[PDB]
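Bug #77: duplicate submission created two jobs. Keeping one. Sequence:
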Amino acid sequence: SNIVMLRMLPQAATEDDIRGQLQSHGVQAREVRLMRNKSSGQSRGFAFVEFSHLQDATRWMEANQHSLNILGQKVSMHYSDPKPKINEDWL
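Kept job's structure:
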């Protein structure tokens, strides 16, 4: 899988906090879904982070033993899908 659902985030965390954590492991995020949007609803105490490479999700997962820590909150990580297999990317 290349998606990393980050459950148990705080309200206060940002898209940019996560950019920091990804880059500390030396992993690009392809995309980040954490607050900001309003519309789709990314502002709940989770993220839906996606990687360019299926291995890279597993990289960030296992290199943190399947738990991160952002603004002190203990965050869990879960594959919410294998990959986005929609035929559209603007729907």
